Amino acid sequence: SGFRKMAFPSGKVEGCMVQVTCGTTTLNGLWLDDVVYCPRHVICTSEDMLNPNYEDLLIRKSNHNFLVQAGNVQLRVIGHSMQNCVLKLKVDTANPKTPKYKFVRIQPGQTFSVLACYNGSPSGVYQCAMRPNFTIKGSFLNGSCGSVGFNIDYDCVSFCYMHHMELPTGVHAGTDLEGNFYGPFVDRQTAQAAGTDTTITVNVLAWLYAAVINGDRWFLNRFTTTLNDFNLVAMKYNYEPLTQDHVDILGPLSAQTGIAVLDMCASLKELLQNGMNGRTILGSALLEDEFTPFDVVRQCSGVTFQ
Amino acid sequence: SGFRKMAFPSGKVEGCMVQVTCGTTTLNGLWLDDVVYCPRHVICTSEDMLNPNYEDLLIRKSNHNFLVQAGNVQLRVIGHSMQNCVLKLKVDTANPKTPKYKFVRIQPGQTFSVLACYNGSPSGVYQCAMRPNFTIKGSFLNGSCGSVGFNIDYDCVSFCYMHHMELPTGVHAGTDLEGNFYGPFVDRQTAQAAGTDTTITVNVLAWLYAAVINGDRWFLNRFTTTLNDFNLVAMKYNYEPLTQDHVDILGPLSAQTGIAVLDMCASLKELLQNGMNGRTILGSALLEDEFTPFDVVRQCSGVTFQ
Ligand SMILES: O=C(C[S@@](=O)C(c1ccccc1)c1ccccc1)NO
Numbered sequence: 223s224g225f226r227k228m229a230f231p232s233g234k235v236e237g238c239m240v241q242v243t244c245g246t247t248t249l250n251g252l253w254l255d256d257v258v259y260c261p262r263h264v265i266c267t268s269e270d271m272l273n274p275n276y277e278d279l280l281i282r283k284s285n286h287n288f289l290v291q292a293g294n295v296q297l298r299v300i301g302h303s304m305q306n307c308v309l310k311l312k313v314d315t316a317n318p319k320t321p322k323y324k325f326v327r328i329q330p331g332q333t334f335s336v337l338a339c340y341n342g343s344p345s346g347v348y349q350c351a352m353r354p355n356f357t358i359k360g361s362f363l364n365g366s367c368g369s370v371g372f373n374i375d376y377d378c379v380s381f382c383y384m385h386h387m388e389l390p391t392g393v394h395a396g397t398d399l400e401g402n403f404y405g406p407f408v409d410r411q412t413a414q415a416a417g418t419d420t421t422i423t424v425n426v427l428a429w430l431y432a433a434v435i436n437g438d439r440w441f442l443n444r445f446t447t448t449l450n451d452f453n454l455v456a457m458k459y460n461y462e463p464l465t466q467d468h469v470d471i472l473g474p475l476s477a478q479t480g481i482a483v484l485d486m487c488a489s490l491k492e493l494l495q496n497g498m499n500g501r502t503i504l505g506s507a508l509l510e511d512e513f514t515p516f517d518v519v520r521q522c523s524g525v526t527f528q
Numbered sequence: 529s530g531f532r533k534m535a536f537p538s539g540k541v542e543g544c545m546v547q548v549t550c551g552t553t554t555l556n557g558l559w560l561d562d563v564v565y566c567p568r569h570v571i572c573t574s575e576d577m578l579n580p581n582y583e584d585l586l587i588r589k590s591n592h593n594f595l596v597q598a599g600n601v602q603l604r605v606i607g608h609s610m611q612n613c614v615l616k617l618k619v620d621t622a623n624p625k626t627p628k629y630k631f632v633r634i635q636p637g638q639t640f641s642v643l644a645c646y647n648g649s650p651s652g653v654y655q656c657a658m659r660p661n662f663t664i665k666g667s668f669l670n671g672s673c674g675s676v677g678f679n680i681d682y683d684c685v686s687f688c689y690m691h692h693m694e695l696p697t698g699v700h701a702g703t704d705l706e707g708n709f710y711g712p713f714v715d716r717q718t719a720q721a722a723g724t725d726t727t728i729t730v731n732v733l734a735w736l737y738a739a740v741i742n743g744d745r746w747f748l749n750r751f752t753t754t755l756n757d758f759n760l761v762a763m764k765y766n767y768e769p770l771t772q773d774h775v776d777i778l779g780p781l782s783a784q785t786g787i788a789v790l791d792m793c794a795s796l797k798e799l800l801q802n803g804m805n806g807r808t809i810l811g812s813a814l815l816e817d818e819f820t821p822f823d824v825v826r827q828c829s830g831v832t833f834q
């Protein structure tokens with residue numbers, strides 16, 4: 223029993239982190255097979271980031287200008303190319319620690335773990351969600367660019383995020399491993415604001431199910447509701463609209479607990495309308511939305527990875 | 529910027545986890561050099577745990593009764609012994625993945641990372657604190673015993689916790705790596721209740737400093753206080769008494785922010801007396817106490833580990 227914000231074990235990713243230096247700029251890269259992946263703004267100076275022409279700036283760079291260091295060992299760069307907003311650096315040595323992996327572009331509302339790194343070295347691991355406005359609420363300081371976000375299924379690491387920017391509001395933006403930004407953000411130091419940070423309704427419901435499984439049930443009530451009725455409340459409180467697809471994904475948690483999805487929606491509705499009256503739910507005084515239904519099942523059942 | 533509940537990278541510990549089976553009981557062990565460490569209640573059945581005599585139950589066990597498996601490979605047990613509440617199983621092969629490590633017994637209020645494992649396999653990582661009542665609020669299911677808690681300093685893993693029990697209230701108890709329980713708990717299925725769960729005042733203050741560094745400053749006020757005056761409030765709200773030693777440890781955070789420790793105590797005092805009026809602090813609607821001053825400095829500065 224107990225429910226915690228849990229990250230995947232990070233070892234398989236730790237073995238992939240390297241340091242990339244171009245000129246006077248140093249950030250992190252991801253070494254998979256004989257390719258190192260990193261943000262293309264490694265080639266920029268602080269002056270450049272105001273209005274960079276990446277294609278023009280890359281013309282002045284050759285293989286030997288990209289210094290790649292894995293732990294204490296230097297890797298030989300034998301080719302380089304730009305794909306969207308990442309660079310791919312071909313090296314002469316396949317990473318012997320390459321895990322089974324894939325590249326995935328995730329949807330808003332999905333969660334992943336982040337290995338924060340500096341100078342190619344791991345600093346910490348934590349769990350995040352892709353917000354509905356395509357930012358993430360992370361913990362990133364200067365030099366953390368190139369750190370990546372990932373999920374694991376048994377033995378396969380699914381890389382879904384590479385860190386690129388910090389917006390002026392303190393939230394974070396980045397790309398998939400093909401270099402396409404999440405959301406409308408660009409790798410330019412300009413005026414880009416985040417949209418509304420709406421709450422991920424299906425994740426809150428899954429967390430309420432997690433609560434019930436662990437003994438926190440004071441919020442269960444005598445009511446039920448319908449999807450349309452609940453969604454009128456969701457709109458008022460800047461919650462994502464709940465669909466039948468969401469109801470279907472919560473089916474297994476409904477089955478294990480015996481609480482119909484729409485009955486749990488009626489509990490959530492009362493919590494949004496009345497607040498929590500100074501009580502807590504799984505140690506939290508607000509409604510948590512960065513656990514997916516899969517996350518809840520996984521933690522409440524003890525799935526492992528070899 | 530941003531502040532997250534962050535765990536240490538777990539790879540160095542992942543490489544130490546093994547599976548231990550005695551009879552029909554399977555839990556996790558920790559393989560360091562040529563010794564595997566695990567809870568002594570691996571030798572018990574469910575019937576035994578009501579009133580076990582561990583010395584008598586061990587007499588019926590020989591080296592070949594302890595089955596130790598690291599990944600897919602079986603380890604040869606060539607000796608075994610009991611130390612307090614852990615067993616030490618000598619094996620014929622030193623773990624090649626043994627990190628630099630030490631065994632440490634931590635104090636209440638100190639934080640550590642937990643690698644939850646099942647059947648010797650890692651499941652997830654999260655951050656915990658040793659509570660003032662010597663429990664931890666974890667996430668542990670059946671089969672998680674032997675999972676361990678640890679800190680890392682550059683290249684040295686300091687093991688401080690091994691998981692042994694779940695109390696009837698859902699909180700968790702366990703030992704250091706010498707097998708001595710934290711607090712008054714015993715490896716018996718009897719009536720053991722936790723004491724008062726007091727809040728770790730020095731950690732809350734450090735987290736308020738973290739908040740200020742990241743732009744959340746609405747709770748700063750015009751007041752100051754004294755240690756004795758603040759502690760009258762701490763007592764009322766079941767907070768740990770604040771000492772000069774605590775004030776001294778917060779010195780560096782005081783210096784970086786320019787906010788005197790006693791001024792931050794006066795902010796905390798108003799927050800305890802008035803609540804947060806529906807606002808949040810670093811994404812939380814209550815006062816977080818599982819970040820130490822060291823944790824705050826580390827995350828706000830980007831310390832790494834090689
Ligand atoms: O190297 C860093 C600083 S980077 O965030 C920042 C940047 C600054 C100088 C050179 C390259 C990039 C930037 C600016 C605009 C848009 C995205 C990123 N972190 O690791």
Ligand SMILES: O=C(C[S@@](=O)C(c1ccccc1)c1ccccc1)NO
Pocket residue numbers: 553554555569570572573574577669670671672673674692693694714715716717718
């Ligand atoms: O094997 C497990 C179950 S264990 O928690 C439980 C126990 C049950 C059967 C055999 C050994 C131990 C126990 C009971 C009383 C005090 C501490 C622990 N988890 O990994």
